[PDB]
């Protein structure tokens, strides 16, 4: 049963990360990204007001808002920190979408994010050491 397999894998990964170990390189990247997001959001709220509700998201304007914010973010450059900002932005978009009962946007926001990573961030990422470098730099924080 894949369901059970995925469960065992998720659980074991969580337990390994709690000790500074990792189930796989993908797992360590995930754990690093989650932690960097928490830290980034913490440092964001202590300086500003929630990145979540500010923009008025609607199914019809969501994409455009995502694109405007995201293009200005990497207009003059890409770096790990901005990527974390990006991930955290997408995350707040989804949280806001669910709060406002536009649950269907979450899978779209998800797609728009992977697409933007695959197309516009991957090049820089490969060129700068891949995600393993990201893990060295933001791992276990």
């Amino acid at each position: 049963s894949q369901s059970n397999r995925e469960l065992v894998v998720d659980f074991l990964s969580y337990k390994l990360s709690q000790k500074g170990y990792s189930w796989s390189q993908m797992a360590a990247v995930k754990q690093a990204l989650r932690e960097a997001g928490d830290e980034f959001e913490l440092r964001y709220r202590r300086a500003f007001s929630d990145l979540t509700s500010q923009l008025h998201i609607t199914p019809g304007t969501a994409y455009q808002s995502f694109e405007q914010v995201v293009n200005e973010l990497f207009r003059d450059g890409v770096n790990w920190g901005r990527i974390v900002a990006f991930f955290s932005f997408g995350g707040a978009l989804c949280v806001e979408s669910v709060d406002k009962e536009m649950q269907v946007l979450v899978s779209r926001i998800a797609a728009w994010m992977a697409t933007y990573l695959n197309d516009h961030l991957e090049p820089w990422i490969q060129e700068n050491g891949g995600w393993d470098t990201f893990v060295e730099l933001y791992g276990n924080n």
């Binding site: 960097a36 830290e39 980034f40 440092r43 964001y44 300086a47 500003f48 990145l51 500010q54 923009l55 808002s65 405007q68 914010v69 995201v70 200005e72 973010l73 770096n79 790990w80 920190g81 901005r82 990527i83 974390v84 900002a85 990006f86 955290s88 932005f89 730099l137 933001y138």
Partner: peptide
């Protein structure tokens, strides 16, 4: 409005940038 976006991008860029610099 739309001015909210410029402002959000800016706050995200500085926050990230500071975050990047503090890991070097």
């Amino acid at each position: 409005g739309s001015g909210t976006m410029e402002n959000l991008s800016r706050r995200l860029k500085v926050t990230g940038d500071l975050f990047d610099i503090m890991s070097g």
